[PDB]
């Protein structure tokens, strides 16, 4: 099996450790871990394109979209590779991640290894919003914490 870890950090209180595991090179990817320091409620959770040696959330930029699709939720047919939907934070600011996804992969041509995991200020509207921006980013507001998705050491 192949494994990865992303350490989420930002300029504020938001931080977390996210794990990835893929047991077969074309198998589903499981994603788990906890993020603390969040406001209660939904927060967009995305793999962004940025793979260069930049500091922080600054350049993370657009969603990881190697197939040039529109933005969606993780269960939508039309989605970016990086569209992992929302995570939910409880009253003391902790969001537990538990995701199984069929579109991301840790191996092959469009592997998410080296790309940037991002947790957002607000909910992702899942591409169902009333403007073109919804179909690009899901209108999830600022990037609160980010980290490179690295092969586990
Ligand atoms: Cu995003
Ligand atoms: Zn590059
Ligand atoms: Zn870059
Ligand atoms: Zn390609
Ligand atoms: Zn997207």
UniProtKB/Swiss-Prot annotation:
The modification Phosphoserine is found at residues 98, 102, 105, 107. Keywords: Acetylation, Amyotrophic lateral sclerosis, Antioxidant, Copper, Cytoplasm, Disease variant, Disulfide bond, Lipoprotein, Metal-binding, Neurodegeneration, Nucleus, Oxidoreductase, Palmitate, Phosphoprotein, Ubl conjugation, Zinc. SUPFAM superfamilies: Cu,Zn superoxide dismutase-like (SSF49329). There is a cross-link at residue 32 (1-(tryptophan-3-yl)-tryptophan (Trp-Trp) (interchain with W-33)). Changing residue 85 to R: In ALS1; ubiquitinated by RNF19A; interferes with zinc-binding; ubiquitinated by MARCHF5; leading to the degradation of mitochondrial SOD1. It catalyses: 2 superoxide + 2 H(+) = H2O2 + O2. Changing residue 16 to S: In ALS1; sporadic young onset. Disulfide bonds join 57-146. A lipid is attached at residue 6 (S-palmitoyl cysteine). The keyword Oxidoreductase applies. GO terms for cellular component: axon cytoplasm; cytoplasm; cytoplasmic vesicle; cytosol; dendrite cytoplasm; dense core granule; extracellular exosome; extracellular region. InterPro entries: SOD-like_Cu/Zn_dom_sf, SOD_Cu/Zn_/chaperone, SOD_Cu/Zn_BS, SOD_Cu_Zn_dom. The keyword Protease does not apply. Belongs to the Cu-Zn superoxide dismutase family. Destroys radicals which are normally produced within the cells and which are toxic to biological systems. It is linked to Amyotrophic lateral sclerosis 1: A neurodegenerative disorder affecting upper motor neurons in the brain and lower motor neurons in the brain stem and spinal cord, resulting in fatal paralysis. Sensory abnormalities are absent. The pathologic hallmarks of the disease include pallor of the corticospinal tract due to loss of motor neurons, presence of ubiquitin-positive inclusions within surviving motor neurons, and deposition of pathologic aggregates. The etiology of amyotrophic lateral sclerosis is likely to be multifactorial, involving both genetic and environmental factors. Homodimer; non-disulfide-linked. Homodimerization may take place via the ditryptophan cross-link at Trp-32. Heterodimer with SOD1. The heterodimer CCS:SOD1 interacts with SLC31A1; this heterotrimer is Cu(1+)-mediated and its maintenance is regulated through SOD1 activation. Interacts with DAOA; the interaction is direct. This is Superoxide dismutase [Cu-Zn]. It comes from Homo sapiens (Human). The gene is SOD1.
């Amino acid at each position: 099996a192949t494994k990865a870890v992303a350490v989420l950090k930002g300029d504020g209180p938001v931080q977390g450790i996210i794990n990835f595991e893929q047991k077969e090179s074309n198998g589903p990817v499981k994603v788990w871990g906890s993020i603390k320091g969040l406001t209660e409620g939904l927060h967009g959770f995305h793999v962004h394109e940025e793979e260069d040696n930049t500091a922080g959330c600054t350049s993370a930029g657009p969603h990881f979209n190697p197939l040039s699709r529109k933005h969606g939720g993780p269960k939508d047919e039309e989605r970016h590779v990086g569209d992992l939907g929302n995570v939910t934070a409880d009253k003391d600011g902790v969001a537990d991640v538990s995701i199984e996804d069929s579109v991301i992969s840790l191996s092959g041509d469009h592997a998410i290894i080296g790309r940037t995991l991002v947790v957002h200020e607000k909910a992702d509207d899942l591409g169902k919003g009333g403007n073109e921006e919804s179909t690009k980013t899901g209108n999830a507001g600022s990037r609160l914490a980010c980290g490179v998705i690295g092969i586990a050491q």
